Amino acid sequence: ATLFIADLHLQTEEPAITAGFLRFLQGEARQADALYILGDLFEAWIGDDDPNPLHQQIASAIKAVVDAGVPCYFIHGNRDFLVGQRFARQSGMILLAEEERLDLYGREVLIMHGDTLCTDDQGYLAFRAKVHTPWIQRLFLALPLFIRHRIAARMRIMDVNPQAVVDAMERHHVQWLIHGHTHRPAVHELQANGQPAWRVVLGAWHSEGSMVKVTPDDVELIHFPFLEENLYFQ
Ligand SMILES: O=C(CCCCCNC(=O)Nc1ccc(S(=O)(=O)N2CCN(c3cc(Cl)cc(C(F)(F)F)c3)CC2)cc1)NO
Ligand SMILES: [Mn+2]
Ligand SMILES: [Mn+2]
Secondary structure: OEEEEOOOOEOOOOHHHHHHHHHHHHOHHHHOOEEEEOOOOEOOOOOOOOOOHHHHHHHHHHHHHHHOOOOEEEOOOOOOOOOOHHHHHHHOOEEOOOOEEEEEOOEEEEEEOOHHHOOOOHHHHHHHHHHOOHHHHHHHHHOOHHHHHHHHHHHOOOOOOHHHHHHHHHHOOOOEEEEOOOOOOEEEEEEEOOEEEEEEEOOOOOOOEEEEEEOOOOEEEEEEOOOOOOOOOO
16 A cells, blocks of 8 residues: 655644654554655754754654655645755655656556645745745755744645646546645545546644555545554443
């Protein structure tokens, strides 16, 4: 099976989500053919030179999955668009483009974070265009770390446009799309390329975890607890 997760929004102040993700990496992920992280792995990112200990803790845990034979892939979210090749090397992850078409057991599947499908929010899309401009990213990353941290602290949900969904699935000629961003886990039926098509949405990790599991036989949207919930009787 191939696994998809997104919208964990990991951060120091939410250790329960981190512990849930570490358990996921040490258990479920080790049995997978591959693990894809469709953006918003971290609640914030100001560059790969950040000494935040959580970053190294997460990189080591993902690296252990990769070393166990499970390739891991990352598409950027709107929270963590500055994740770069240094973190890719630390974690063993492979960075992918904003849209990718996958062969999953003979099923062609488009994957993306999902924010680019929210074409009704033109203000957001203009902000996105600016922070994805390479010369702007370069200038921001050149600032001292302490300045970047102040900017980020100081700076501290839209849904998809149905026609943007059809356009993306016809551009890639797929009948299956998996994304996150909207935090509304669901399976939507539509029509694309003259045939029934499906859009599968991941959940954010709020109280419990969420993943999509693709097998040769089906597509599974799965909700599971962060920790081992030991039975006990009354
Ligand atoms: O979860 C969700 C969220 C719902 C959708 C909300 C969309 N809005 C949103 O995401 N905002 C946002 C805010 C702060 C951060 S940040 O703290 O990580 N960090 C990033 C780098 N960043 C920067 C970069 C560059 Cl290049 C240039 C500059 C500037 F401005 F100084 F020039 C700053 C400083 C701030 C990241 C994202 N959807 O699924
Ligand atoms: Mn998110
Ligand atoms: Mn997002």
